[PDB]
Amino acid sequence: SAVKAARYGKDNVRVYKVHKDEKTGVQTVYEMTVCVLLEGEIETSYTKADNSVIVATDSIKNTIYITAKQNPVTPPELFGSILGTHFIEKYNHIHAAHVNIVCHRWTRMDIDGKPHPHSFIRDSEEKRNVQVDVVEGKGIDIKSSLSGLTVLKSTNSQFWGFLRDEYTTLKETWDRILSTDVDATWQWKNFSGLQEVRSHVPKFDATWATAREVTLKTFAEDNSASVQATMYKMAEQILARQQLIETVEYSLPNKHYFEIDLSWHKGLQNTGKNAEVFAPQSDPNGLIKCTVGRS
Amino acid sequence: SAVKAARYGKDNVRVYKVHKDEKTGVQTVYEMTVCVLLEGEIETSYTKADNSVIVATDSIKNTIYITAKQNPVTPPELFGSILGTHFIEKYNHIHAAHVNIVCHRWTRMDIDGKPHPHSFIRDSEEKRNVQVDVVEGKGIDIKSSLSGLTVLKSTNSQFWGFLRDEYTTLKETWDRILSTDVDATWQWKNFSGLQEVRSHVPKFDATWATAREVTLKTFAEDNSASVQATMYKMAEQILARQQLIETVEYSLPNKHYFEIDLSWHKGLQNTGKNAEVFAPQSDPNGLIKCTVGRS
Amino acid sequence: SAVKAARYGKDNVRVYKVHKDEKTGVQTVYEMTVCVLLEGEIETSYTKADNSVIVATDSIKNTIYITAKQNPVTPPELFGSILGTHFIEKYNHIHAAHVNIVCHRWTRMDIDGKPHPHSFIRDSEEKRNVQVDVVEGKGIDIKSSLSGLTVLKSTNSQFWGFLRDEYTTLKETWDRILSTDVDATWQWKNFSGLQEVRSHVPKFDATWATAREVTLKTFAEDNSASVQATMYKMAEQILARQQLIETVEYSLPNKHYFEIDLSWHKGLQNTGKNAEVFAPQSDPNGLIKCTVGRSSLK
Amino acid sequence: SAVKAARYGKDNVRVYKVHKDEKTGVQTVYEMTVCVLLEGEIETSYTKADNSVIVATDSIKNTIYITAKQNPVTPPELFGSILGTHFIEKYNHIHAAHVNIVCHRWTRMDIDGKPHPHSFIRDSEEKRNVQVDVVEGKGIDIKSSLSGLTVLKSTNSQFWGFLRDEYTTLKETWDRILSTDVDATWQWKNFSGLQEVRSHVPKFDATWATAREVTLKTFAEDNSASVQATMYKMAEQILARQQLIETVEYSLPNKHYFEIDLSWHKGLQNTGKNAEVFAPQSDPNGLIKCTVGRS
Numbered sequence A, B, D: 001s002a003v004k005a006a007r008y009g010k011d012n013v014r015v016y017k018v019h020k021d022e023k024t025g026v027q028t029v030y031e032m033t034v035c036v037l038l039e040g041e042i043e044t045s046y047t048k049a050d051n052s053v054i055v056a057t058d059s060i061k062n063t064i065y066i067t068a069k070q071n072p073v074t075p076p077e078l079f080g081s082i083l084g085t086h087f088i089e090k091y092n093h094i095h096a097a098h099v100n101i102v103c104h105r106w107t108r109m110d111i112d113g114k115p116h117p118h119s120f121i122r123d124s125e126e127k128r129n130v131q132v133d134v135v136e137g138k139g140i141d142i143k144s145s146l147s148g149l150t151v152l153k154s155t156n157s158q159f160w161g162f163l164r165d166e167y168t169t170l171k172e173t174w175d176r177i178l179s180t181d182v183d184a185t186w187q188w189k190n191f192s193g194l195q196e197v198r199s200h201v202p203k204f205d206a207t208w209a210t211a212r213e214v215t216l217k218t219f220a221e222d223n224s225a226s227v228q229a230t231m232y233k234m235a236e237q238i239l240a241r242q243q244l245i246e247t248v249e250y251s252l253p254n255k256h257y258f259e260i261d262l263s264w265h266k267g268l269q270n271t272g273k274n275a276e277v278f279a280p281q282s283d284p285n286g287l288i289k290c291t292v293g294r295s
Numbered sequence C: 001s002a003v004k005a006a007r008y009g010k011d012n013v014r015v016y017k018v019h020k021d022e023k024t025g026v027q028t029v030y031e032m033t034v035c036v037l038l039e040g041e042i043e044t045s046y047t048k049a050d051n052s053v054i055v056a057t058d059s060i061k062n063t064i065y066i067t068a069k070q071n072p073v074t075p076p077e078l079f080g081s082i083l084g085t086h087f088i089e090k091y092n093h094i095h096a097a098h099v100n101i102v103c104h105r106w107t108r109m110d111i112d113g114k115p116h117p118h119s120f121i122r123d124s125e126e127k128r129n130v131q132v133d134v135v136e137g138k139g140i141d142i143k144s145s146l147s148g149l150t151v152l153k154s155t156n157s158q159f160w161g162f163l164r165d166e167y168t169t170l171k172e173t174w175d176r177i178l179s180t181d182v183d184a185t186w187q188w189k190n191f192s193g194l195q196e197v198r199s200h201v202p203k204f205d206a207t208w209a210t211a212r213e214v215t216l217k218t219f220a221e222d223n224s225a226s227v228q229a230t231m232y233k234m235a236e237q238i239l240a241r242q243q244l245i246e247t248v249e250y251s252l253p254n255k256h257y258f259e260i261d262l263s264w265h266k267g268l269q270n271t272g273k274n275a276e277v278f279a280p281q282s283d284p285n286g287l288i289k290c291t292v293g294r295s296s297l298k
């Protein structure tokens, strides 16, 4: 037998960093959960229980704390680059570092219409993430994304014209509720190394912002009979607005809301045009995915 | 042996209701999870396996759907009252109904600066709930509350002057991070029945909005060395701003952020006045509670 | 305005303790989650921001570790009592201590038929808990319980003869699936103090064992048309087997498994006597509760 | 822009199936959660909102129920294969089917030392899963696995001899607690079609059983100072005991238990040789992985 693959590292490293502006007195907070996995000439730890080739996970944790102390933790795309680069550069037997960052929301509070200098609210469970893969002599690969975005539109969504056979029972419809969680990932073009990445820093937040906006607006405005069709529209726009992205990927799990027939009770009318009360379903759920790249 | 207590019913009934303005076109959505537990002359179902006295849990379900169909589901306090009352009135052997209602956020989206007619976002996992106890001959007891509000303030909190003994290792502090989930409950004065409730409808949404604003503002503005002191101030204002409320209750589960000493590494300074990076702690956590009523 | 109530403390204190037997070389582990909430003359922390009356939550933490270090952590009823007692005894202004303990399963592993000296497996998400209320000059009240016990029986469960009216659509049945989580609490007769508690130590593990056995066996054996009727039988037996218990309380959340009509497809028969494939329902669910105590009759 | 990749389907389909022995009276249950994702000539749904190429997710759900009704649902490897094969055979435009199945434990109850005919207990949150890829012309790829197996050994584990630099603070140790959730997967050698699979049916349950036993035994018995080392030994034995397996893959998320220094209190001894009470850490946690194959 032989080791075909191997990674090890620290997961769920919660980090919090505050930024204070001495002048204005305004404080800004950043809180993420970090995961670093190393790859390299570490087989013998597996085959001959050799720990000499092992950088302790505990130390990988220390390293995350120290790196965050001495560098900007935002955008996450930068921080992940800086961090993964450190691993390949400081150790001769480490050849690849895979950094995953999840950024949690700490929205500044508006008290009396003015933004509070140092008070935040977790205004949603939505997350902004990055998966940075820094490989030796192969550059830096960055996948950015947003996840945990939950939306619903009460109308302006239909589903008809789908295949029908002896397994079909679903009725066609020209008005329905559409609710989903959005998971949207945009892959950047390979970067040669840290410098190239620093050069593009402003593109990061911008693109995130753009991707969010596009998703929300398109979801709201599109009156479609295809979730597939809608996602694709989203993709296109993102690709159009940022040349440095190679692919865009969308995963939408479709949360269903069923009509409740109440006719059996005093001929109560609650379906079709009369539907008012529905039963949200916890499961199962449709799942639609797609990766869209350039022609 | 004897039955000293007994309740049964249906839990986790998910309900969705839409409101359509034919004129303006604007739609509005309401989603909530409902639990209804009944009390009455049911012993015999326990003692002699007699099902005759049992209104099925499935029918309690149907009832919820039917009630929602034919009544306003907002405010929650009203809906809970209508629902509870239904049970004690329609059944001779049923003498108490306990209705729990958890309301989920479906905040209308702003596209391009304008509120969208029919598109919503789950803009937070915070919930607005109500526990409504409808007891025969005793009227209607309503507990209203907000939960799942998570907040953080990077400074303007201290802790010092606490009891010190042989079990004490905590160091006193004049600048610390304060984060907590907020669970706030205000109890209304007993209502005589459905009509007295209906008469007060406007106070419900109004009080909720007050309770929340007071909480947010006081948290942000108070620079205290007592979370206890802060919670108390919150209570006072709420009781002050609304005569019909008998008690206000707060439960704050603290979330600790620890300082990380990095001095062992190149004498890096990251504590006291230099603290920048902190370690968010998943557990354990402080838990402070208190019920405040009128003098 | 005035403070009508007030409790503060530390929640979610995770604790693990190992016991070694130097002779046999066998090792035993205990892991629980602990919450301690204090009550007393502390109003001033709320009204006048006075921290002098506050034992810091961090110190409540240290105290749990230290107590765990110098005392048995089992049974949890004992530990909780020792722990609660400590707070009222060491502070003059603290009059009540409420300790909640959740015990986690770390079941010894059987390797090649033989119990392993030091290896364990989390063989289930069922918990054994205790709620211990130590109030000054009012003794020690103990509520013991098991939770997170999930069971299912594929048959020998019915539901018919229930009230029918204009809200009813449920069809009567003589064979159905019964699945539930079991939450069972037995409340002990008040104890004067730590001594009384120590004197009854053996009763603890035994009653827990009994409660669990009675629940499983009754559930399995009872062919009922009432979950209520089944819970009630369980209560009785527990009460019968232990005189020091004042009340038994059961809370069973009923998880439903629907029948799936497939007749629309090639006249497929999957209902009634031919039901084989069901759709388990995540929600909603029935919830049945009841507290049973001892009769005043003779 | 162009559609580089696209799948869609039904997630979280809970299915329950009972087996009744008319002779013995003994019943047996099976509960699993199923996900089916289809791949094929479906681009147009994305690009031209064409639903004619879309087999409704609902119908995929109906199919799962139907298939379960007319086929064995055990071993999952088989069911998955039958299920995925159905999709590529019945639809001309569908060329891939990806079926995921999670199996929940419903262990038979021992009442008075005798196995009960129809009573079960969820005796663990440990799962047995399968991922079955059915690609037209490419055969059937099956990954089998066990997950959610949590274990802890109080002693007979050390960690010393690992790399030490300026980022290191971890002390070496000759006795330490070792706890971890185990996620173990074994990949089968490609099968040509449903028949080849049918022909190996018995190997499925047998290998699952072996994989489990090997993992428990090795974990218990191995006195190592390398989790990497231990994992490896587990994989070797699994490969050794079953020729049809191509690779075995372990993911071990290490759960830490810290020592608690209590010396500051009346010189209490609770470290090193005297360690009795420990603080289990919720996070962060080490994570070791590795894929082992044949030399």
Ligand SMILES: O=c1cc[nH]c(=O)[nH]1
Pocket: B159, B225, B226, B227, B228, B286, C008, C054, C055, C056, C057, C058
């Ligand atoms: O009691 C306590 C303990 C810690 N921090 C507070 O604000 N109060």
Ligand SMILES: O=c1cc[nH]c(=O)[nH]1
Pocket: B008, B054, B055, B056, B057, B058, C159, C226, C227, C228, C254, C286
């Ligand atoms: O009341 C009820 C209703 C359904 N099923 C039960 O066991 N009890």
Ligand SMILES: O=c1cc[nH]c(=O)[nH]1
Pocket: A159, A225, A226, A227, A228, A286, D008, D054, D055, D056, D057, D058
């Ligand atoms: O394929 C499908 C099925 C259901 N609903 C959609 O939007 N797409």
Ligand SMILES: O=c1cc[nH]c(=O)[nH]1
Pocket: A054, A055, A056, A057, A058, D159, D226, D227, D228, D254, D286, D288
């Ligand atoms: O690197 C490490 C650290 C802790 N435990 C392991 O198995 N490996």
